[PDB]
Write an enzyme that holds these catalytic residues in place. Structure first.
Site, PDB file in Angstrom:
ATOM      1  N   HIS A  73      37.352  37.356  47.772  1.00 10.14           N
ATOM      2  CA  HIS A  73      38.514  37.158  46.912  1.00 10.14           C
ATOM      3  C   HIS A  73      38.650  38.414  46.057  1.00 10.14           C
ATOM      4  O   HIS A  73      37.902  39.383  46.234  1.00 10.14           O
ATOM      5  CB  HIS A  73      38.415  35.839  46.135  1.00 10.14           C
ATOM      6  N   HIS A  75      38.356  39.366  42.866  1.00 13.21           N
ATOM      7  CA  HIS A  75      37.661  39.732  41.644  1.00 13.21           C
ATOM      8  C   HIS A  75      36.654  40.864  41.870  1.00 13.21           C
ATOM      9  O   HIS A  75      36.153  41.096  42.978  1.00 13.21           O
ATOM     10  CB  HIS A  75      36.955  38.514  41.066  1.00 13.21           C
ATOM     11  N   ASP A  77      33.554  41.284  41.128  1.00 11.63           N
ATOM     12  CA  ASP A  77      32.197  40.961  41.587  1.00 11.63           C
ATOM     13  C   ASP A  77      32.111  40.821  43.101  1.00 11.63           C
ATOM     14  O   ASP A  77      31.043  41.071  43.658  1.00 11.63           O
ATOM     15  CB  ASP A  77      31.652  39.696  40.882  1.00 11.63           C
ATOM     16  N   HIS A 136      37.873  28.423  42.701  1.00 11.33           N
ATOM     17  CA  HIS A 136      37.586  29.493  41.744  1.00 11.33           C
ATOM     18  C   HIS A 136      38.775  30.450  41.576  1.00 11.33           C
ATOM     19  O   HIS A 136      39.100  30.870  40.457  1.00 11.33           O
ATOM     20  CB  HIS A 136      36.341  30.233  42.210  1.00 11.33           C
ATOM     21  N   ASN A 167      33.652  30.171  33.884  1.00 11.75           N
ATOM     22  CA  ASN A 167      35.021  30.457  33.481  1.00 11.75           C
ATOM     23  C   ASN A 167      36.025  29.797  34.409  1.00 11.75           C
ATOM     24  O   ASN A 167      35.900  29.845  35.637  1.00 11.75           O
ATOM     25  CB  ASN A 167      35.314  31.953  33.406  1.00 11.75           C
TER      26      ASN A 167
HETATM   27 ZN   LIG Z   1      35.703  35.496  41.057  1.00 13.09          ZN
HETATM   28 ZN   LIG Z   2      32.082  35.248  40.544  1.00 10.96          ZN
END
Ligand SMILES: [Zn+2]
Ligand SMILES: [Zn+2]
Ligand code: NA
Ligand code: NA
Ligand SMILES: [Zn+2]
Ligand SMILES: [Zn+2]
Ligand SMILES: [Zn+2]
Ligand SMILES: [Zn+2]
Ligand SMILES: [Zn+2]
Ligand SMILES: [Zn+2]
Ligand SMILES: [Zn+2]
Ligand SMILES: [Zn+2]
Ligand SMILES: [Zn+2]
Ligand SMILES: [Zn+2]
Ligand SMILES: [Zn+2]
Ligand SMILES: [Zn+2]
Ligand SMILES: [Zn+2]
Ligand SMILES: [Zn+2]
Lengths: 216, 215
Positions: A73, A75, A77, A136, A167
């Site tokens: 995805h 993000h 990380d 997420h 989060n």
């Molecule tokens: Zn993420």
């Molecule tokens: Zn993550």
């Protein structure tokens, strides 16, 4: 605090990036898969510097090139080392909407996108990429190795010692429960389930994530 | 410096650390939670790690330890026996582990068994089995047939191990045959947990064999 790599199957490794956040160090897990014809990267490091270490590791110990890298995805990380990957000529490949969300958040641009659930094979090794729904993030995908029966769930799955979902800002709390149940119904014989931010386990990681999603 | 991580909904791995020959080495055991108490596979790596371990169990599982089962006589799997026994917990081992414990100034177990045993506590089934000498003459493994989890202790090596490690009390000629006994008694094991490295799939058994055709 660097990057760590551990072997879980004869051809599968978990790479772990670290970052200290407030109090305590947070890991980020990806996979490396070795094939007869090159290595596959599932997730980049947690940014450029972990990703350069990861590349150096692959070249020293697997002594083969990375054929492809598949972020799960948009993000940082799971994809913040894409620029580092692409600067070495390695194709980064994502879902269409992962590419869209990356563009809207000034992340790099994948080299190829796929709009379909895909099963492909490199070097005798077969991989499945699958979209179970938003959880997420709106775009999170999982990767299944049907031969080793290893399911990589990224930040869609939580580890058995997580006490909450962390989060929830980009989170899709309403869809996450059905995405987990899709995973439970599609990989009933998965042996290992790899989360992003804690230790891996058996299919108990799916039921535990379901439990966190009924107690918020 | 004890650490505990969960791998299944009712199974934890407890890990003590030590530096041995300039490297940091983990020692893993299991905690299994049951409806009637906790089962401990291996003690801590000595007194202080085991009292940490005992305290951990009391704080987070909030249930007593029903029994503790070391997998062989070395300190990493048995060096915390006294601390377990001072809390009234029964330590039970194979007969030969008791003999070797007495022969090497480890404590005295509370019960010994001469038979491969299947037993159940609080809904949970456990199997103890002797595949033959390998890392030590008396090493046994523990299998959870419901979770298909095999604890191989120091008989199995992790996939990043480059040699067999401590071989002092080892029985190198039998060790290969014990790995093959494990491969054929647990063909459908999902997780294999070694003592001194990360766990994985049944690749860990074929890898330990490999270290054993190339020593
Ligand atoms: Zn993420
Ligand atoms: Zn993550
Ligand atoms: Na998408
Ligand atoms: Na783990
Ligand atoms: Zn290839
Ligand atoms: Zn190659
Ligand atoms: Zn660059
Ligand atoms: Zn592809
Ligand atoms: Zn795809
Ligand atoms: Zn596969
Ligand atoms: Zn997690
Ligand atoms: Zn929403
Ligand atoms: Zn030992
Ligand atoms: Zn000893
Ligand atoms: Zn016994
Ligand atoms: Zn011995
Ligand atoms: Zn040992
Ligand atoms: Zn595992």
């Amino acid at each position: 605090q660097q990057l760590e790599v551990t072997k879980i199957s004869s051809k599968v490794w978990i790479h772990t990036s670290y970052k200290t956040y407030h109090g305590t160090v947070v890991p980020s897990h990806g996979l490396i898969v070795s094939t007869k014809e090159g290595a596959v990267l599932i997730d980049t490091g947690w940014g450029k510097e972990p990703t350069e270490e990861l590349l150096t590791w692959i070249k020293t110990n697997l002594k083969q090139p990375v054929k492809v890298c598949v972020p799960t995805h948009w993000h940082d990380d799971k994809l913040g080392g894409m620029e580092a990957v692409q600067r070495q000529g390695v194709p980064v490949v994502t879902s269409e909407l992962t590419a869209i969300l990356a563009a809207e958040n000034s992340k790099g641009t994948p080299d190829v996108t796929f709009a379909t659930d895909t099963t492909f094979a490199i070097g005798g090794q077969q991989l499945e990429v699958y979209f179970p729904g938003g959880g997420h993030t709106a775009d999170n995908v999982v990767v299944y190795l049907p031969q080793q029966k290893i399911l990589f769930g990224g930040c869609l799955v939580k580890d058995l010692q997580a006490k909450n979902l962390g989060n929830t800002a980009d989170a899709d709390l309403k869809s996450w429960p059905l995405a987990i149940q899709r995973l439970q119904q599609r990989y009933p014989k998965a042996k290992v389930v790899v989360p992003s931010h804690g230790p891996w386990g058996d299919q108990s990681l799916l039921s535990h994530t379901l439990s966190l999603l009924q107690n918020q």
